[model samples]
Target: GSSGSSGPLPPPRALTLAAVTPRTVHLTWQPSAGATHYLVRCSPASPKGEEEEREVQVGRPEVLLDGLEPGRDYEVSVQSLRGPEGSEARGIRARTPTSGPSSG
Candidate 1:
């Protein structure tokens, strides 16, 4: 008989908005224990109701997302996939900057 630990893989850690721009966001995180890759789900936060998001499969801990709308609170989540199991997701929120705002 073979014995081993089996279940969903542990999710990534320390997820953060590493960088941000008017139309882009840079997200990064620490690797998971046995994560083969990561799935990033990006969407708009509350208040605004719209479906302009995407879920991307990435091979690294960092992802660069562009062509986003400015001055919006975006929510991004990261999940880990190992073998055939997927771990829970880690989420974060950040507001994009405006191109030319702050008018007095």
Candidate 2:
């Protein structure tokens, strides 16, 4: 008999973000099996799309999103990619403060 390798594809997992800092934020999440690369998207948490969604390569579980506007709220999301096309992003939210406790 021939090989019966006919089956449907499975959905991808979601990504998570954490460590909100002033002008920076750390992103982390669970490992997605069969995922070649990951797509990261960052934007202003505001309703308006003032900020653009920046993409990055997935290498490690933790990544730092730096060089951001201080005191501004930002939103970050990640997507698992296999080839040129990418899957849905694991929606996440974050915001950076002005940094430091107090300058005095």
Candidate 3:
């Protein structure tokens, strides 16, 4: 008889936007035990928008995105990957602020 834990893998949870800047955004989430790495995707969240898709491989629970255009809406998705398999993706939408000087 084989002794192994045979059950469904857990999903990535508690994904949140931790911080944002004019050219960057930071994301955080709970790490899954079955995940070897994380796949992060960022794309434009507008209709008829042609934004380049960005992908990142991360070994931690957080990621920081830079070089993004300001005042644009972006959709970010995070997936927990175990080898060739991946869990359900969690997502969030955020917009960057203008880089110009703020009138205080």
Candidate 4:
């Protein structure tokens, strides 16, 4: 038998957003011990205020959300999408930055 720790392992946590530019965002997260892949998404608020988002897969630990509108508001999120029925994932929400002063 193999020696092991107690209790279930923690899910991937602390998903975060950074490198926020006028039209782009860089997302990152603490690595999960058992995760094999990650999923990310970004979307502007719909006219009716629903989350009509689009998703992308990242085989690594971080992802960059790009091609957003400058100076506009957007939402970003990340999740680990491997293992089991894909329900044992961690997630977080993020806001992209506005255009910088030097933006033209």
lDDT of 3: 0.79
TM-score (all chains, Cα) for each model = 0.80, 0.65, 0.78, 0.64
Clashing pairs in 3: none
Query: Best candidate, TM-score-wise?
Result: 1
Question: Once superposed on the true structure, which residue ranges of model 3 sit more than 4 Å away at CA?
Answer: 1-7, 48-51, 99-104
Judged by TM-score relative to the true structure, which candidate is superior, 3 or 4? Answer: 3
What residue pairs are clashing in model 2? Answer: none
Candidates 2 and 3 compared by lDDT, better number? 3
Task: Report the error of model 1 at residue 67, Å.
Answer: 0.6
lDDT (10s digit) by residue, model 3, range 47-78 = 75665788989999798888777888888888
For every candidate in turn, the CA RMSD to the true structure comes to 4.8, 6.2, 4.9, 5.0
Computed on alpha carbons, the lDDT of every model, listed in order, comes to: 0.79, 0.64, 0.79, 0.61
Error in Å for residue 38 of model 4: 1.2
Residue 63 in model 4: shift from native, Å?
A: 0.8
Tens digits of lDDT, candidate 2, 18-53: 676676788777655456677666667877665467
Off by over 4 Å in 1: 1-8, 47-52
Global lDDT of model 1 = 0.79
> What is the alpha-carbon lDDT of model 4 when measured against the actual structure?
0.61
C-alpha RMSD (angstroms) for model 3: 4.9
Clashing pairs in 1: none
State in Å the error of residue 34, model 4. 1.1
